[PDB]
């Protein structure tokens, strides 16, 4: 049956592959090689515990992943530490979708946040992710805006 | 006339006061004391150069502030390093508004980003900030969602 564990340094090449697989599944054009940058990101953030990535395994093949990154923003009255958990790297094997795996992963990620005294979580919703997060209680945020420096000047 | 400089450690108590002033101007309820957390945030992020806060001064009173924080997200094909500049702490003295001060500050912050090989900037728009950022080229982002752990469980 399914087993859940937190990824270790030893798991990095798998996390890297699964992240690429996830992004391509989301429709992104894999135009350039980002292996070096992905591997460095996982190495650094896992080593410093600024990233926690849960995995679901069966027959020691990864069925699903889900991560939370801890990010620092300026304190405000509604979030005195300024810290937030940033949810990312969520992927469930297609034949395993619709069984509540990602939803149960969200529970585990929320727990990582609470254990670190974090009570605000955020994420960027993909097409498939969106109804899952909406169902879970994530809220629309018309306030977030982004500037691409290659596009505007 | 106006002088612009980057804030130093010595400026922290001013940055702290101006941030509170800014948030209250935005309509937030200053319900709890966050001086300790604000001071620690500035101390840490300035010391490590993960925050750059520009100030505009006249007669050595601060007229405006504007900051950019450098935050790490997982690499993707459209942002290979995963890094982003997060714009924050923008405030212009009310009698000085509408003169293009915040807009010129945005130019300086974009420059901080480029000098660090960052080409994606993001922010959370306040009521007064929004038309400024829209005019500047920031784009709506329906993908960002947030969960408040005190509200949903
Ligand atoms: C923040 C980010 O990480 S964004 C990127 C997200 N990942 C991707 O887009 C990669 C490609 N897509 C995927 O890997 C997947 O579709 C994921 C990860 C988004 C979702 O994984 P899943 O394990 O299929 O999620 P989960 O099973 O919890 O929910 C999906 C659906 O099954 C249903 N479901 C799950 N559990 C139950 C249940 N107990 N009773 C009834 N329906 C259920 C959901 O309600 C939902 O269907 P709906 O849209 O009609 O409401
Ligand atoms: C990401 C964050 O930091 S969000 C928080 C932002 N800060 C706050 O909300 C705190 C309270 N509000 C403020 O301090 C201010 O209103 C700020 C910081 C948002 C804006 O500061 P300002 O210096 O007034 O911005 P700026 O002068 O560049 O632009 C504001 C307006 O003056 C006008 N303006 C500026 N320069 C010109 C110009 N050269 N020609 C014509 N109009 C101009 C703008 O077009 C705009 O008016 P509009 O809404 O009709 O388009």
XYZ file of C-alpha atoms and ligand atoms in Angstrom:
408
model
C 0.000 0.000 0.000
C 0.939 3.680 -0.198
C 3.769 4.968 1.971
C 4.426 8.627 2.793
C 7.808 10.118 3.725
C 9.708 13.413 3.590
C 12.350 13.627 0.857
C 16.067 13.467 1.804
C 19.192 14.666 -0.004
C 19.380 11.198 -1.607
C 16.039 11.847 -3.350
C 17.093 15.002 -5.213
C 17.517 13.558 -8.717
C 13.977 12.093 -8.438
C 12.502 15.402 -7.229
C 14.210 17.144 -10.115
C 12.757 14.694 -12.663
C 9.280 14.813 -11.158
C 9.277 18.621 -11.143
C 10.108 18.710 -14.863
C 7.442 16.086 -15.506
C 4.926 18.179 -13.554
C 5.686 21.404 -15.401
C 5.462 19.710 -18.771
C 2.124 18.173 -17.719
C 1.032 21.772 -16.926
C 1.737 22.749 -20.543
C 5.006 24.627 -20.131
C 7.510 24.579 -22.998
C 10.710 22.834 -21.819
C 12.833 25.149 -23.992
C 16.031 25.257 -21.999
C 17.928 22.918 -19.697
C 17.295 23.783 -16.037
C 18.733 20.660 -14.439
C 21.607 22.529 -12.799
C 19.336 25.181 -11.272
C 16.707 22.689 -10.078
C 19.388 20.489 -8.458
C 20.976 23.478 -6.757
C 17.552 24.704 -5.530
C 16.729 21.337 -3.927
C 20.228 20.912 -2.509
C 20.194 24.321 -0.840
C 16.606 24.489 0.413
C 16.496 20.913 1.685
C 19.831 21.283 3.460
C 18.635 24.452 5.228
C 15.122 23.079 5.875
C 13.551 25.978 3.962
C 11.777 23.371 1.809
C 9.876 20.238 2.878
C 8.783 17.888 0.098
C 6.526 14.984 0.955
C 6.391 11.950 -1.315
C 3.887 9.119 -1.686
C 5.496 5.869 -2.801
C 4.297 2.439 -3.827
C 6.611 -0.440 -4.749
C 9.222 2.277 -4.265
C 8.088 4.269 -7.274
C 6.939 7.823 -6.508
C 3.187 8.222 -7.017
C 2.850 11.815 -5.789
C 4.842 14.751 -4.462
C 3.893 17.962 -2.628
C 6.173 20.625 -1.143
C 6.056 23.680 1.064
C 8.726 26.395 1.058
C 9.079 28.851 3.931
C 9.439 32.390 2.698
C 9.978 35.675 4.574
C 7.940 38.808 3.872
C 7.826 42.000 5.941
C 5.798 41.659 9.169
C 2.300 43.106 9.228
C -0.438 43.336 11.848
C -2.196 40.276 10.409
C 0.984 38.197 10.164
C 3.404 39.444 12.812
C 6.396 37.302 11.764
C 5.883 38.012 8.062
C 6.577 34.359 7.245
C 4.460 32.354 4.825
C 4.420 28.787 3.594
C 4.578 28.609 -0.194
C 3.071 25.422 -1.598
C 4.629 23.983 -4.733
C 5.851 20.873 -6.541
C 2.508 19.135 -6.337
C 2.101 16.229 -8.717
C 0.007 13.092 -8.670
C 0.515 10.254 -11.198
C -2.363 10.570 -13.703
C -3.827 7.084 -13.145
C -3.821 7.882 -9.408
C -5.655 11.220 -9.663
C -9.093 11.895 -8.158
C -8.474 9.716 -5.107
C -7.775 12.587 -2.716
C -3.991 12.218 -2.752
C -3.166 15.875 -3.386
C -5.864 16.889 -0.851
C -4.312 14.674 1.832
C -0.884 16.082 0.917
C -2.245 19.585 1.576
C -3.110 18.409 5.118
C 0.497 17.305 5.642
C 1.841 20.612 4.311
C -0.454 22.630 6.552
C 1.000 20.630 9.424
C 4.578 21.564 8.414
C 3.480 25.196 8.561
C 1.868 24.984 12.003
C 4.902 23.221 13.481
C 6.916 26.289 12.426
C 4.390 28.824 13.726
C 3.185 29.803 10.259
C -0.489 30.473 9.628
C -0.546 32.012 6.159
C -0.042 29.790 3.097
C 0.067 30.822 -0.531
C 0.584 29.194 -3.910
C 0.271 29.683 -7.650
C -2.580 27.570 -8.975
C -2.210 25.512 -12.141
C -5.240 24.555 -14.271
C -5.646 21.180 -12.582
C -4.586 22.439 -9.190
C -7.072 25.287 -8.975
C -10.339 23.413 -8.159
C -8.396 21.306 -5.627
C -7.123 24.393 -3.812
C -10.487 26.171 -4.140
C -12.213 23.131 -2.634
C -9.643 23.199 0.179
C -10.248 26.836 1.112
C -7.619 28.810 -0.764
C -8.899 32.280 -1.682
C -8.650 34.458 -4.808
C -6.090 37.267 -4.453
C -6.657 40.168 -6.871
C -3.852 42.046 -5.092
C -0.863 40.060 -6.482
C 0.698 41.625 -9.578
C 3.782 40.689 -11.569
C 6.235 42.543 -13.811
C 8.334 40.754 -16.412
C 11.484 42.801 -17.004
C 11.934 41.365 -20.508
C 8.455 42.704 -21.448
C 8.134 46.192 -19.945
C 10.590 49.089 -19.944
C 16.221 69.463 -3.251
C 15.383 65.762 -3.000
C 18.165 63.300 -2.246
C 17.995 59.539 -2.815
C 20.020 56.917 -0.930
C 19.855 53.259 0.109
C 18.998 52.673 3.771
C 21.735 51.482 6.186
C 21.549 49.669 9.525
C 21.480 53.112 11.190
C 18.153 53.857 9.460
C 16.222 50.886 10.865
C 14.126 52.679 13.500
C 12.970 55.127 10.774
C 12.107 52.306 8.346
C 10.156 50.615 11.106
C 8.160 53.787 11.857
C 7.503 54.532 8.199
C 6.303 50.976 7.557
C 3.761 51.245 10.386
C 2.696 54.649 9.086
C 2.267 53.172 5.600
C 0.174 50.226 6.753
C -2.074 52.437 8.835
C -2.490 54.758 5.827
C -3.575 51.615 3.900
C -6.384 51.078 6.421
C -4.952 48.217 8.458
C -5.905 47.940 12.133
C -2.748 48.356 14.265
C -4.101 45.880 16.840
C -0.891 44.431 18.185
C 2.665 45.631 18.723
C 4.959 44.418 15.928
C 7.968 46.611 16.646
C 10.170 43.681 17.650
C 9.353 41.674 14.516
C 9.722 44.639 12.144
C 13.102 45.572 13.681
C 14.325 41.994 13.444
C 13.124 41.736 9.808
C 15.037 44.874 8.773
C 18.117 43.924 10.782
C 18.337 40.476 9.210
C 17.408 41.252 5.604
C 19.496 44.415 5.362
C 22.521 42.715 6.900
C 22.291 39.844 4.389
C 21.411 42.136 1.454
C 18.155 40.247 0.853
C 16.355 43.601 1.143
C 17.207 46.953 -0.471
C 15.183 49.955 0.686
C 15.611 53.242 -1.125
C 14.707 56.493 0.604
C 14.009 59.994 -0.693
C 14.998 62.701 1.775
C 14.652 66.453 1.996
C 16.042 68.558 4.848
C 16.921 65.111 6.182
C 13.313 64.110 6.721
C 12.191 61.032 4.772
C 9.707 61.937 2.032
C 9.362 58.486 0.449
C 10.516 54.892 0.761
C 10.454 51.893 -1.600
C 11.970 48.435 -1.107
C 12.687 45.256 -3.002
C 13.209 41.873 -1.333
C 14.888 38.992 -3.148
C 12.972 35.778 -2.725
C 13.694 32.229 -3.944
C 11.080 30.069 -5.666
C 11.644 26.783 -7.500
C 13.254 27.212 -10.946
C 11.019 26.964 -13.991
C 11.595 27.186 -17.738
C 10.513 30.840 -17.777
C 12.637 31.809 -14.770
C 15.598 29.438 -14.615
C 17.007 30.659 -11.274
C 13.582 30.773 -9.623
C 14.458 34.097 -7.989
C 12.076 37.043 -7.912
C 12.215 40.590 -6.630
C 9.352 41.333 -4.251
C 8.469 45.020 -4.092
C 7.255 46.387 -0.778
C 7.447 49.201 1.768
C 6.421 51.853 -0.713
C 5.248 55.090 0.844
C 5.192 58.676 -0.323
C 4.357 61.583 2.035
C 0.773 62.618 1.173
C 1.562 66.245 0.264
C 4.271 64.879 -2.058
C 2.052 62.389 -3.915
C 1.239 62.603 -7.634
C 4.672 63.935 -8.574
C 6.017 60.636 -9.900
C 8.076 59.783 -6.821
C 6.841 56.212 -6.401
C 7.121 55.703 -10.195
C 10.760 56.833 -10.174
C 11.372 54.580 -7.155
C 10.071 51.634 -9.200
C 12.801 52.419 -11.771
C 15.445 52.216 -9.038
C 14.039 48.922 -7.740
C 13.977 47.397 -11.209
C 17.646 48.326 -11.412
C 18.412 46.483 -8.139
C 16.802 43.418 -9.698
C 18.757 43.558 -12.960
C 22.068 43.994 -11.134
C 21.305 40.664 -9.426
C 20.213 38.886 -12.611
C 16.528 38.930 -11.691
C 13.901 39.578 -14.342
C 10.634 38.733 -12.605
C 9.177 41.155 -10.039
C 6.032 40.758 -7.993
C 4.142 42.673 -5.329
C 0.861 42.936 -3.462
C -1.002 46.035 -4.592
C -2.663 48.362 -2.098
C -5.623 50.573 -3.089
C -3.423 53.572 -3.843
C -0.585 51.498 -5.205
C -2.615 49.594 -7.772
C -3.074 52.247 -10.529
C 0.614 53.177 -10.128
C 1.734 49.590 -10.696
C -0.844 49.054 -13.463
C 0.416 52.191 -15.212
C 3.962 50.845 -14.839
C 3.229 47.487 -16.469
C 2.484 45.119 -13.611
C -0.013 42.439 -14.662
C -3.053 40.845 -12.988
C -2.332 37.349 -11.635
C -5.465 35.223 -11.144
C -3.192 32.283 -10.278
C -2.105 33.417 -6.766
C -4.242 31.971 -3.969
C -3.916 32.194 -0.202
C -5.004 30.055 2.752
C -5.402 31.488 6.238
C -4.882 28.674 8.742
C -6.967 30.452 11.394
C -9.949 30.464 8.968
C -10.035 27.061 7.254
C -9.676 23.576 8.719
C 0.704 24.939 -6.170
C 1.043 23.932 -7.199
O 1.735 22.966 -6.915
S 0.341 24.035 -8.722
C 0.723 22.615 -9.718
C -0.169 21.426 -9.470
N 0.174 20.207 -10.161
C -0.137 20.012 -11.536
O -0.923 20.746 -12.136
C 0.495 18.827 -12.233
C -0.511 18.063 -13.013
N -1.710 17.774 -12.227
C -1.644 16.897 -11.077
O -0.598 16.319 -10.779
C -2.921 16.727 -10.291
O -4.063 16.911 -11.058
C -2.977 17.521 -8.944
C -1.722 17.317 -8.162
C -3.206 18.991 -9.252
C -4.129 16.969 -8.115
O -3.865 15.684 -7.624
P -5.061 14.765 -7.170
O -4.407 13.704 -6.328
O -5.781 14.195 -8.438
O -6.008 15.695 -6.287
P -7.281 15.190 -5.506
O -7.480 13.682 -5.728
O -7.137 15.557 -4.032
O -8.473 16.046 -6.092
C -8.733 16.063 -7.474
C -10.164 15.668 -7.782
O -10.602 14.348 -7.294
C -11.699 14.527 -6.385
N -11.758 14.005 -5.030
C -10.585 13.722 -4.219
N -11.000 13.118 -3.042
C -12.431 12.988 -3.099
C -13.344 12.459 -2.196
N -12.878 11.911 -0.938
N -14.787 12.457 -2.537
C -15.230 12.986 -3.753
N -14.302 13.528 -4.674
C -12.887 13.531 -4.343
C -11.852 16.042 -6.171
O -12.965 16.586 -5.538
C -11.404 16.588 -7.508
O -12.351 16.702 -8.545
P -13.178 18.035 -8.827
O -12.322 19.018 -9.656
O -14.457 17.635 -9.641
O -13.582 18.695 -7.526
C 3.768 46.982 -3.201
C 3.450 47.984 -2.162
O 4.343 48.619 -1.620
S 1.844 48.363 -1.841
C 1.706 49.732 -0.717
C 1.816 51.085 -1.373
N 1.835 52.228 -0.494
C 0.646 52.737 0.100
O -0.472 52.402 -0.292
C 0.800 53.758 1.206
C -0.099 54.920 0.994
N -0.009 55.441 -0.369
C 1.215 56.048 -0.847
O 2.180 56.206 -0.098
C 1.227 56.483 -2.292
O -0.034 56.801 -2.777
C 2.013 55.536 -3.260
C 3.351 55.198 -2.691
C 1.182 54.288 -3.504
C 2.245 56.281 -4.567
O 3.180 57.315 -4.434
P 3.209 58.478 -5.496
O 4.554 59.121 -5.296
O 2.011 59.449 -5.227
O 3.120 57.764 -6.918
P 3.236 58.511 -8.302
O 3.436 60.019 -8.079
O 4.362 57.879 -9.115
O 1.879 58.189 -9.044
C 0.643 58.484 -8.442
C -0.220 59.359 -9.328
O 0.357 60.650 -9.743
C 0.450 60.681 -11.176
N 1.658 60.962 -11.932
C 3.002 60.719 -11.432
N 3.911 61.220 -12.352
C 3.161 61.806 -13.431
C 3.569 62.441 -14.597
N 4.982 62.595 -14.875
N 2.548 62.958 -15.540
C 1.186 62.806 -15.264
N 0.767 62.158 -14.078
C 1.765 61.651 -13.151
C 0.057 59.280 -11.674
O -0.194 59.022 -13.017
C -0.942 58.849 -10.624
O -2.294 59.216 -10.784
P -3.371 58.281 -11.494
O -3.894 57.229 -10.492
O -4.555 59.196 -11.964
O -2.761 57.578 -12.688
